[PDB]
Amino acid sequence: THWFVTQRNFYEPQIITTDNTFVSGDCDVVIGIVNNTVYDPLQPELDS
Amino acid sequence: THWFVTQRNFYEPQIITTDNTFVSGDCDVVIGIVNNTVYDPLQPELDS
Ligand SMILES: *[C@@H]1O[C@H](CO)[C@@H](O[C@@H]2O[C@H](CO)[C@@H](O)[C@H](O)[C@H]2NC(C)=O)[C@H](O)[C@H]1NC(C)=O
Ligand SMILES: *[C@@H]1O[C@H](CO)[C@@H](O[C@@H]2O[C@H](CO)[C@@H](O)[C@H](O)[C@H]2NC(C)=O)[C@H](O)[C@H]1NC(C)=O
Ligand SMILES: *[C@@H]1O[C@H](CO)[C@@H](O)[C@H](O)[C@H]1NC(C)=O
């Protein structure tokens, strides 16, 4: 149901965050791309 | 005109940002240092 990022030698899922991913390009030129949400922890801090 | 940071084996320029850099010392003990401006995306996030 959810998506996580983990290492390739031990199972240790983490929730997707901007600190864990690297952004580049557009959503057209990648085969097999899947859609989900990339979170941002700074928004609650800014709103508070 | 502009200064970028890129990898060594494939030309892919990224905009100079405080996330890509690392701070140490002052501007007197490095030969060939160059004046420029290091941007910061935190200010628009915390202001706008
Ligand atoms: C993104 O998720 C959606 C929903 O599953 C997929 O469907 C398309 O999404 C884009 C933008 O998210 C829309 O512009 C299209 O109209 C959607 N097509 C539909 C609903 O048939 C999409 O495949 C996912 N991936 C991308 C890259 O959009
Ligand atoms: C470019 O960098 C040099 C050295 O970092 C600057 O030279 C110094 O500038 C300060 C004030 O900006 C002065 O107080 C010093 O006397 C200057 N020293 C020398 C040896 O010139 C220079 O001003 C910088 N230029 C710009 C446009 O920022
Ligand atoms: C390269 O050599 C020139 C000599 O004309 C000098 O002015 C310049 O500072 C040198 N650049 C570096 C990075 O040392």
Q: Portion of residues in helices of chain A?
A: 10-25%
General form of chain A: extended
Count of extended strands of chain A: 2
* Bound chemical compounds: a molecule of 2 linked components (NAG-NAG), 2-acetamido-2-deoxy-beta-D-glucopyranose
Tally of DSSP helical segments of chain A: 1
Indicate the radius of gyration of chain A in whole angstroms. 13 Å
Strand content of chain A: 5-15%
Describe the oligomeric state of these chains in a short phrase: part of a larger assembly
* N-C termini distance of chain A: 30 Å
Protein name (chains A, B): Spike protein S2'
Glycosylation sites (chains A, B): 35
Quickly list its features:
part of a larger assembly; 2 chains; 48 residues; little secondary structure; two-stranded antiparallel sheet; 1 helix; 2 strands; 12% helix; 8% strand; extended; binds a molecule of 2 linked components (NAG-NAG); binds 2-acetamido-2-deoxy-beta-D-glucopyranose; Spike protein S2' (chains A, B)
